Design a binder for this molecule. Structure first.
Ligand SMILES: CC(=O)N[C@H]1[C@H](O[C@@H]2[C@@H](O)[C@H](O)O[C@H](CO)[C@@H]2O)O[C@H](CO)[C@@H](O[C@@H]2O[C@H](CO)[C@H](O)[C@H](O)[C@H]2O)[C@@H]1O[C@@H]1O[C@@H](C)[C@@H](O)[C@@H](O)[C@@H]1O
Ligand SMILES: [Ca+2]
Ligand SMILES: [Ca+2]
Ligand SMILES: [Mg+2]
Length: 131
C-alpha cells in the first residue's frame, strides 16, 4: 500500500499534483476532477505553507480552489467551505484588490493574489491518500 499514485506528492495524509501546463480556473477544476481530485482546497496553515513553497520555489503562478465568484468579497473554497479569517494573512499585501474583477485565487510569490478567473495558470490538485 502506497498513499498516493505515482507522480503525486504525499503530504500529511493527502496527495498533491501540480500541472505542467496552464489552464483557466474553471478548466483547472475540471482537470482535477478528471484525475479523481479537486483543485486544492487548503485546510490548515501548515498545508498552506507546504503548498506556497511549491509556487514560490518554481516561481510559478498557480491556481487554488478558492473564489469569490458567487459573492464579491466572500471567498469560498470549491468544496463550499468559507475562507476562514485564519487565512487572510496569506493574501499578498494589497490583495485581494479585485481589479477588473478578479474572483479566483492563485499562489503568487510568497502569498495569494486574486486574479482574472479566465487567465491560464498552473494548478495543483489534491485528493486524500489511499486507505
Ligand atoms: C490597477 C492595475 O491594473 N494594476 C496592474 C498594473 O497596472 C498599471 C496601471 O494601473 C498603470 O496605469 O499603468 C501601469 C503601466 O505603466 C500598469 O499597467 O500593472 C501591473 C503589471 O502588469 C499589474 O500587476 C501584475 O498583475 C499580474 C496579474 O496576472 C501578475 O500578478 C503580475 O505578477 C503583476 O505584476 C497590476 O495588476 C493588479 O495588481 C497586481 C498586484 C495584482 O493584484 C493583479 O491581480 C491586479 O490585476
Ligand atoms: Ca473578486
Ligand atoms: Ca489582484
Ligand atoms: Mg465577480
Amino acid at each position: 500500500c502506497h498513499p498516493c499514485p505515482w507522480e503525486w506528492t504525499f503530504f500529511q495524509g493527502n496527495c498533491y499534483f501540480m500541472s505542467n501546463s496552464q489552464r483557466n480556473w474553471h478548466d483547472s477544476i475540471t482537470a482535477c476532477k478528471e484525475v479523481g481530485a479537486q483543485l486544492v482546497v487548503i485546510k490548515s496553515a501548515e498545508e498552506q505553507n507546504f503548498l506556497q513553497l511549491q509556487s514560490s520555489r518554481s516561481n510559478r503562478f498557480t491556481w487554488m480552489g478558492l473564489s469569490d465568484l458567487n459573492q464579491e468579497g466572500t471567498w469560498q473554497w470549491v468544496d463550499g467551505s468559507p475562507l476562514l479569517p485564519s487565512f487572510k494573512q496569506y493574501w499578498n499585501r494589497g490583495e485581494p484588490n479585485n481589479v477588473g474583477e478578479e474572483d479566483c485565487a492563485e499562489f503568487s510569490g510568497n502569498g495569494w493574489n486574486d486574479d482574472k478567473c479566465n487567465l491560464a495558470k498552473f494548478w495543483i490538485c489534491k485528493k486524500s491518500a489511499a486507505s
